[PDB]
Each structure stands twice: as structure tokens, then as C-alpha cells.
Amino acid sequence: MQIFVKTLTGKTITLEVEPSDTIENVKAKIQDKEGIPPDQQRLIFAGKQLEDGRTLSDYNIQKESTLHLVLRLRG
Amino acid sequence: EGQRWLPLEANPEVTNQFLKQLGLHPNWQFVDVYGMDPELLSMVPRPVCAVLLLFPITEKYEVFRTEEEEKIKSQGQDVTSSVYFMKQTISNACGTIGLIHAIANNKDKMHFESGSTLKKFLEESVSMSPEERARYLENYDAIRVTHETSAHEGQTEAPSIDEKVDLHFIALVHVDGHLYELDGRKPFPINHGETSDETLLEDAIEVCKKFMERDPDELRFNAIALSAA
Ligand SMILES: *NC[C@H](*)CC(=O)OC
Ligand SMILES: [Mg+2]
Ligand SMILES: [Mg+2]
Ligand SMILES: [Mg+2]
């Protein structure tokens, strides 16, 4: 199934995932597409912070859901 | 004094702990900003008294900064005397300067512990010039030490102090009806137009949008809002 990940700038990243995918796996997929290291990624779904060990299913993230990506960058 | 500090992570947990260590009570807390549309901005608790924006100081950005500086010097702008502005004279201290700008310009709204080191810094520097404030920070151990400790916190590992940093923090605040961008690398605050206590977040985000559309190939932006808690 597909899910969409939106950045602060408004860019939409489309990912091919499975309900069984862990947040860690989703971050790795984002790295492959955007080159953003997982450590710098904080994923959000409907206002909730997502943790690496849980799965999309755990957060009830279904097909075509949109997650929001916050970047933990150093200034 | 030529010192170099470590770059701070754009993370509410880190910034809120930094403020706690400097003696500010937690009824104001930074939160993440997930997007720029009404629906996502509605998730940010109100009121919002400051927005810290982390953005890339790329070559394209510097061209704009250079043009902006000359435009403002040649055409003028308004900057109210109420604004507290300090220059950046310490490499990588932008995070601390951004936090100082956010609290300094909202000081009357804050609740400080009796021996708060941030409160002391602000009270002692209240009548200093932007340049004198930078010199004062260069000698203020309490903040140097806290910044260092906070620099090691976060989701990411702190880099080497000599590694290149091309991301910067600026503060956006509302003072006397106008939105001001406070960047210690600039010669003065930047007036971005009108705003109010109630629309600061939205108006600050419009400025953030400008930064983003100037650098279309960059995704490296982060905005945190200092919200009531
Ligand atoms: N993130 C460190 C502060 C910004 C900076 O390095 O200015 C050059
Ligand atoms: Mg405290
Ligand atoms: Mg609330
Ligand atoms: Mg006061």
C-alpha cells in the first residue's frame, strides 16, 4: 500500500509500505528516497509522535494515510 | 574572544531543557510545527510568542541576505526601541542567541526562578547595545556551559566543533505590532511587516515560507513555536 509523508516545506514523499512495517523501516525508506538520515527524522501521525519499534498497524496507519516528517537538524 | 560552540538540535525537548536549566519555569514550552497550512498550525497551542526557524545558509541564501542588507540600509525600515537585539560573535552560538532573542523580547510574560541565570543575563544586558550584548555573552560562563550540555542532547549525535555547519537559527517575534526577524549575523533586526499577539504564528510562517521558496532544492528547515503550557 502507499502512504504519503509530508515535510514542513510541503513536499510529499510517496512510500510503498506494508502494515507490518516498523517506523524504523519507514525512516529507512525515506532515507533511500530523500537521503535524510533516520536519526534526523521524527515522524508524526494525526498529532502523535511515532516510535521506531512500533508498526504502522500499531498506530492504525492504513492505505493512503499521510504522516508528517519533522527534521531534527543542528543549527 | 574567538570561541566556538557546538550547534544545537532543533528539538523542543532540547530547547525546553535548556530553558529549564537557565531558570525559566515551564508554563511556556516549545513545540514542533508539522506544516504550514491552517489544519497543522491549529495543532500548535496558543498563544505563541516566538518562532525559531532553522534554515540553510546556502550560497543562494547569502545572495539574498546581501541584497536585503543593502536594501534596508539604502531604503530604511522601522525598528522599535523595545526590540532586544544581540549580535552573534561566537561561532555556532546561533541556537543560544535564538533562545535569548525569544525570551528577551517576551520577558514580561515569563516566570523565572529566583536565581535564574537567563534572567540575570537579561537584566544585566537590558541597557547594553547589540554589540555589548555579544561581548557580554562571550564572558557569561553559565550560558556557555548550559549550551554545551544541551548541544550533546537530542536525537542526533553532536558533531565535531570544527565541522562545517550550514544551518542557522533565527527568531521571529512580535513587538509593538510588527514581526521582527532576529538574526545575530545581520546588522539589525529585520521588520517583516505587521502582526499581532494572536496571529504571530501564522505571520511568522509566511516569512518561513519565503525562506523556503528562495531555496526550492532544500528540505532542511525546522520551525518550533514557543507556546503557552
Ligand atoms: N547552527 C549554528 C549557528 C549558525 C551558524 O553556524 O552561523 C554561521
Ligand atoms: Mg527552571
Ligand atoms: Mg491546548
Ligand atoms: Mg519583565
Quickly list H helices, B105-191: 117-125, 130-138, 141-151
Is A34 an 8 Å CB contact of chain B?
yes
| Closest chain B residue to A11, measured at CA | B219
Close Cβ partners of B116 (under 8 Å, ≥ 6 residues apart): B22, B23, B24
Residue whose cell numbers read 529507512: A28
Among B residues 68-87, those touching chain A with beta carbons less than 8 Å apart = none
Q: Does the CB atom of residue A75 touch ligand 1 within 6 A?
A: yes
Q: Residue B208 catalytic?
A: no
Contact in structure between B85 and B182 (CB atoms under 8 Å) = yes
How far apart CA B122 and CA B136 sit, in angstroms, is 11
Quoted resolution (Å)? 1.5
Closest to A4 in 3D by CA, of A37, A24, A29 = A29
Rg of chain A over all Cα atoms, to the nearest angstrom: 11
Number of DSSP helices (H) and strands (E) in chain B, helices first = 8, 6
Closest to A25 in 3D by CA, of A65, A4, A54, A63 = A54
Residue A42's alpha-carbon distances to A21, A24, B12, B203, in angstroms, are 16, 10, 12, 25
Give the domain ranges of chain B: 1-229
Cβ atoms within 10 Å, residue B120: 16
How far apart CA B229 and CA B177 sit, in angstroms, is 24
Q: Which helix (H) or strand (E) segment is B228 a member of?
A: strand B222-228
Task: Give the domain CATH number at A45.
Answer: 3.10.20.90
Strands in A2-7's sheet, in edge-to-edge order, are A12-16, A2-7, A66-71, A41-45, A48-49
What are B152's three cell numbers? 550533546
Q: With contacts defined as CB-CB under 8 Å, which chain B residues touch A6?
A: 35
How far apart CA B211 and CA B99 sit, in angstroms, is 20
- Domain range for A5: 1-75
Catalytic residue among B94, B174, B178, B208: B94
Question: In this complex, which of A9, A11, A40 lies closest to B156 when CB atoms are compared?
Answer: A40
Distance B119 CA to ligand 4 centre (A): 9
Residue whose cell numbers read 524504523: A24
Query: Of the CATH numbers 3.40.50.740, 3.40.50.460, 3.40.50.300, 3.40.532.10, which one belongs to the domain with range B1-229?
Result: 3.40.532.10
**How are beta strands A2-7 and A66-71 bridged, if at all?**
parallel
Residue B58's alpha-carbon distances to A14, B45, B212, B220, in angstroms, are 27, 32, 12, 11
Contact in structure between A44 and B127 (CB atoms under 8 Å) = no
Quote the distance between the C-alpha of residue A57 and its chain's center: 13
